[PDB]
Design a protein around this nucleic acid. Structure first.
Lengths: 93, 26, 90
DNA sequence: GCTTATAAATAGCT
DNA sequence: AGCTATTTATAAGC
């Protein structure tokens, strides 16, 4: 964008909702590309601040979640903390 | 899934797996 | 990248696996930013071609999926077909 | 795996 | 919702 934004809660309600709508599509778009390019199955679940539910599934949500119940544990599990640290880490060298 | 809703059977299995601590989500 | 790639299965196994690893992080990174910037809760579930499970949750996966089971239907549901159409037109 | 040349995404406005 | 200037995300390649 015209200016680099820090990663912290957007204060302005109008701008927060606009960024939400466009970044949400951007994320689904990238999920779609990832599923086709690398032949994987993807599900995305998003709850906004008002607890409204937005979802995306490369194939069918029912299909992806049913399959998830079949696994005892993931091969890889990440959270914001993990991503933040990986980013903080690369910041040095 | 019509509107994207998952069946009750799937839904209940997810909840059980998670609650009974038998899910990858734990 | 140096060249624009079409969105279709990557034929070369080595390149497919490399693109997978980096785009997967790219997707999680963007999910993280979206959760912080707009104060939302996000869960991501990915199964690769070998059925291996990779996941991300802004808070806690257990928390997000449990909450999901409470909804009868989503406010918005999208699939590859829907995204493809949105891209084709406009 | 680590760089570099390009293609994408998207912030600030209107 | 339509417009650009920058910031990011990457396709190739070592």
């Amino acid at each position: 964008g015209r200016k680099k934004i820090q990663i912290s809660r957007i204060l302005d309600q109008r701008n927060r909702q606009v960024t939400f709508t466009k970044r949400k599509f951007g994320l689904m778009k990238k999920a779609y590309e990832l599923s086709v390019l690398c032949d994987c199955e993807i599900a995305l679940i998003i709850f906004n601040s008002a607890n409204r539910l937005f979802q995306y599934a490369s194939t069918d949500m029912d299909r992806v979640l049913l399959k998830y119940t079949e696994y005892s544990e993931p091969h890889e599990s990440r959270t914001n903390t993990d991503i933040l640290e990986t980013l903080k880490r690369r910041g040095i060298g | 899934s019509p509107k994207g809703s998952i069946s009750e059977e799937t839904k209940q299995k997810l909840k059980s797996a998670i609650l009974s601590a038998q899910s990858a989500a734990n």
